[PDB]
Design a protein around this ligand. Structure first.
Ligand SMILES: *[C@@H]1O[C@H](CO)[C@@H](O)[C@H](O)[C@H]1NC(C)=O
Ligand SMILES: *[C@@H]1O[C@H](CO)[C@@H](O)[C@H](O)[C@H]1NC(C)=O
Ligand SMILES: *[C@@H]1O[C@H](CO)[C@@H](O)[C@H](O)[C@H]1NC(C)=O
Ligand SMILES: *[C@@H]1O[C@H](CO)[C@@H](O)[C@H](O)[C@H]1NC(C)=O
Ligand SMILES: *[C@@H]1O[C@H](CO)[C@@H](O)[C@H](O)[C@H]1NC(C)=O
Ligand SMILES: *[C@@H]1O[C@H](CO)[C@@H](O)[C@H](O)[C@H]1NC(C)=O
Ligand SMILES: *[C@@H]1O[C@H](CO)[C@@H](O)[C@H](O)[C@H]1NC(C)=O
Ligand SMILES: *[C@@H]1O[C@H](CO)[C@@H](O)[C@H](O)[C@H]1NC(C)=O
Lengths: 294, 294, 49
């Protein structure tokens, strides 16, 4: 007739004990930003990052996330987050994204085809506009080959358009690949400068260095419960285990791909995980004609 | 300062065979009593490894290509081997890793260095008091900028020349993947002098560093012995001592690894060595019965 | 006996396949994603299994 399943009694969250905060101030509140042809990369690790702020505040122009949903970034633990900072034009904001080929994408900064991160961009016209023209920002236009993802080129050599090799003369059919942006307050919105940061994070089996601002609860054993071990969500029964983990090991997969053992972050204990009880349910009847007992 | 060593006689290189060596734990998951197939950079079985022996004066410090990875095995009795440098050009124009185990402690510094032509660590021996003290540090001239630095806790070692046979073998695997310098290590007591032992011992991960630099060349560092017996200047008044090490290179291969009940690798099958190994891969077993197999 | 065990082993091992989705675990897809974006990948997993 049906199936029988035991239901969880409670839920438990076990996240590492780090009180440090992530230096978002350096990233977004920086007085100066580098050029697009040489973007700036920073690593953020061993800190707590709150993505609820910087999403409902500062009125960021574009907040587009690929592979994750922003509401869930509070509930996720990440490994080795990177921040890439540069300054581009308004229309070029479209070009920096998965696919979406463009001159910036082709010759300045290429995002990987498989991307899991959030691109944030805001309008900094007032800061980066000079009445005489803000010429401190430069961009690349002529490169021999398309850039590989997450790569930057700083080579400044005279580009050879056709024959007659330049040999450093910058003559006919010889142009400098680097050109200076001209930014002034009296310009169109599309031509106004924009400041862009790209947050890219890797989901790995390695212990999660960065974790959301989510509290922890006490451990419970021998009962069907939900568990949230470092973003690993499951339902089952936890028991003490005699498995002999080596110090670098953190999980256990048994023969299939499913996890069967785990290491409690705070107390460094090995816990065996077993599924809750399930089975079929059958009804034995002598026939409605004879009786209604079962 | 930098001094070009002299009184060194060049000899043709020597080659030996690696008999089932260079197997490490691929990931951090725990598995027990299973046969697991892994595709990764491994040292192929029964392969040429270049063998260097410092004993002419045989000052064996040649710069070697890094390639995709390195398997370095040193048979040591007097701690002659100290450390390594890893650099694309090593001329202070391109930044270079240095991992040096000096008398006080291990020091892992990624800093632009003006490396000397013949880097080494000159340890001086005094006759009036029988002791060895490191005095010359000829690794580099100066450090322009130090993006990454790390000094470990102090410790003391004998640093005394031994007139016996080689008693310990130290195996290391160095890789650069995803901007990560991974070092796997192990040590085994063996009495062999000039032959690489024929046995199996897995290498546990030792450290994963976020160096993130481009490496295409590396060099070893030796402990130079100076005493009253050797007369001359820094370039001539020295003796090499007795030491031996072996260098092999990693290649992308598929391996079948056997885990025991304690979750330790005990045996491995190289998949593309010969047809019988291929049948063992296909059947997922270490024993094959009589018959014909696709 | 060997044939029955082999069939069951293939059936269980088949759960690890992506079938084109981002991952082979439903609990990971349910997080990290909103329902309109999660439904298509859950569909791919359903079809394969
Ligand atoms: C930047 O500074 C303002 C105060 O001037 C502050 O409100 C804001 O939170 C700061 N942003 C970051 C990312 O620290
Ligand atoms: C914090 O976690 C560490 C392990 O990372 C543990 O040894 C320590 O006792 C914990 N402290 C608290 C506040 O529970
Ligand atoms: C070693 O030889 C090189 C190349 O001839 C030279 O540039 C360097 O000055 C020499 N170092 C000495 C003599 O200490
Ligand atoms: C490679 O191994 C073979 C084994 O017979 C040996 O003869 C040879 O000298 C080694 N080195 C090269 C470069 O072939
Ligand atoms: C070894 O290196 C460390 C770090 O540079 C230094 O503090 C220490 O004095 C050095 N010791 C020797 C023996 O040179
Ligand atoms: C490296 O050091 C030189 C000399 O002090 C300095 O001019 C240069 O800006 C430094 N570069 C970096 C990236 O720190
Ligand atoms: C590393 O440097 C070498 C020599 O300068 C160069 O050929 C190679 O392309 C570089 N690799 C990367 C990833 O920059
Ligand atoms: C596992 O470790 C225990 C404890 O040292 C040992 O008695 C046992 O023999 C080991 N198992 C194997 C297969 O070596």
């Amino acid at each position: 007739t049906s199936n029988f399943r035991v239901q969880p009694t409670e839920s438990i969250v076990r996240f590492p004990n780090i009180t440090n905060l992530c230096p978002f101030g350096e990233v977004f509140n920086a007085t100066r930003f580098a050029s697009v042809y040489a973007w700036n990369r920073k690593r953020i690790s061993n800190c707590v990052a709150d993505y609820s702020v910087l999403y409902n505040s500062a009125s960021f122009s574009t907040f587009k996330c690929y592979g994750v949903s922003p509401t869930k970034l509070n509930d996720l633990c990440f490994t080795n987050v990177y921040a890439d900072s540069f300054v581009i034009r308004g229309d070029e904001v479209r070009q920096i994204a998965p696919g979406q080929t463009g001159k910036i994408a082709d010759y300045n900064y290429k995002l990987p085809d498989d991307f899991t991160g959030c691109v944030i961009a805001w309008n900094s016209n007032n800061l980066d506009s000079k009445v005489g023209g803000n010429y401190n920002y430069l961009f690349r236009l002529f490169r021999k080959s398309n850039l590989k993802p997450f790569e930057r080129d700083i080579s400044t050599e005279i580009y050879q358009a056709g024959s007659t090799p330049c040999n450093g003369v910058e003559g006919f059919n010889c142009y400098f690949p680097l050109q200076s942006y001209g930014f002034q307050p009296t310009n169109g919105v599309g031509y106004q400068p924009y400041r862009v940061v790209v947050l890219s994070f890797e989901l790995l089996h390695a212990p999660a260095t960065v974790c959301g601002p989510k509290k922890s609860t006490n451990l419970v054993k021998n009962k069907c419960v939900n568990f949230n071990f470092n973003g690993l969500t499951g339902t089952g029964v936890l028991t003490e285990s005699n498995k002999k983990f080596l110090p670098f090991q953190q999980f256990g997969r048994d023969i299939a791909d499913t996890t069967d053992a785990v290491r409690d972050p705070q107390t460094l204990e090995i816990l065996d995980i077993t599924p809750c009880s399930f089975g079929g349910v059958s009804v034995i009847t002598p026939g409605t004609n004879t009786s209604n007992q079962v | 300062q930098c001094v070009n060593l002299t009184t060194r006689t060049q000899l043709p290189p020597a080659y030996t065979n690696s008999f089932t060596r260079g197997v490490y734990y691929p990931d951090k998951v725990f598995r027990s009593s299973v046969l697991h197939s892994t595709q990764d950079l491994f040292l192929p079985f029964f392969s040429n490894v270049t063998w260097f022996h410092a004993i002419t004066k045989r000052f064996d410090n040649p710069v070697l290509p890094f390639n995709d990875g390195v398997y370095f095995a040193s048979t040591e009795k007097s701690n002659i081997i100290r450390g390594w440098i890893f650099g694309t050009t090593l001329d202070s124009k391109t930044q270079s890793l240095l991992i040096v185990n000096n008398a006080t402690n291990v020091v892992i510094k990624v800093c632009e260095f003006q490396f000397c032509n013949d880097p080494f660590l000159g340890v001086y021996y005094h006759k009036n008091n029988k002791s060895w003290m490191e005095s010359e540090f000829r690794v580099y001239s100066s450090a322009n900028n130090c993006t990454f630095e790390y000094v470990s806790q102090p410790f003391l070692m004998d640093l005394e020349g031994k007139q016996g046979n080689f008693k310990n073998l130290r195996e290391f695997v160095f890789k650069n993947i995803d901007g990560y310098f991974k070092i796997y290590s192990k040590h085994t007591p063996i009495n062999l002098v000039r032959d690489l032992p024929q046995g199996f011992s897995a290498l546990e991960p030792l450290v994963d560093l976020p160096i993130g630099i481009n490496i295409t060349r590396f060099q070893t560092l030796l402990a130079l012995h100076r005493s009253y017996l050797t007369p001359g200047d820094s370039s001539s008044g020295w003796t090499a001592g007795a030491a031996a090490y072996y260098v092999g290179y990693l290649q992308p291969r598929t391996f079948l690894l056997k885990y025991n009940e304690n979750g330790t690798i005990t045996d491995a099958v190289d998949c593309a060595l010969d047809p019988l190994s291929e049948t063992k891969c296909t059947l997922k077993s270490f024993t094959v019965e009589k018959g014909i197999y696709q | 006996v060997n044939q029955n065990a082999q069939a069951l082993n293939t059936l269980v091992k088949q759960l690890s396949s992506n079938f084109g989705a981002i991952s082979s675990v439903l609990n990971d897809i349910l997080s990290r994603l909103d329902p309109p974006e999660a439904e298509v990948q859950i569909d791919r997993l359903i079809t394969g299994r």
